[PDB]
């Protein structure tokens, strides 16, 4: 007698399961792999998250700006405030897309830990420092703040304390 594991839709976070006799399979989707417990996919590449991006000279050599955060993972860029990640630099997908709910499974301001795939906050102030330039950063659990000095006032758009 077998369960099927994959009709619990929680089954592999992130992944596509294949149900065997006895347990399941996840086939992680490109640029994921599998976690250590295999219960789920995660991307551990590493780059930098950009704030801007914007055709802007189009592709070739280069194509992202205004870096601010570097050697980060890919969630935890795009499933907070980056717009584009990596090099080459690719874009961040578009939060009502498909590849949106594998990367970022929790929604906004979380990510898969890296080895157990349990969601967990993206410590901002730690990762995207680029965040507060000049300021005074206090994450928080789904999101963080940023406070700047007596006398200046926070850039939205280049978030530069003025
Ligand atoms: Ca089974
Ligand atoms: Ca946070």
Do not use: H
């Amino acid at each position: 007698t077998d369960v099927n594991e994959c009709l619990d839709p929680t089954t592999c976070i992130s992944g596509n399961c294949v149900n065997t006799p006895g347990s399941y399979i996840c086939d992680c989707p490109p640029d994921f792999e599998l976690n250590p417990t295999r219960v789920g996919c995660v991307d551990t590449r590493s780059g930098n998250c950009y704030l801007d991006i914007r055709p802007r000279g189009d592709n070739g050599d280069t194509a992202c700006s205004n870096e601010i955060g570097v050697g980060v993972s890919k969630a935890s860029c795009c499933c907070s405030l980056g717009k584009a990640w990596g090099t080459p630099c690719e874009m961040c997908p578009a939060v009502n897309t498909s590849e949106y709910k594998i990367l970022c499974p929790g929604g906004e301001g979380f990510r898969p830990n890296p080895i157990t795939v349990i969601l967990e906050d993206i410590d901002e102030c730690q990762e995207l420092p680029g965040l507060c330039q000049g300021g005074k950063c206090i994450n928080t659990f789904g999101s963080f703040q940023c406070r700047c000095p007596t006398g200046y006032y926070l850039n939205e758009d280049t978030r530069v304390c003025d």
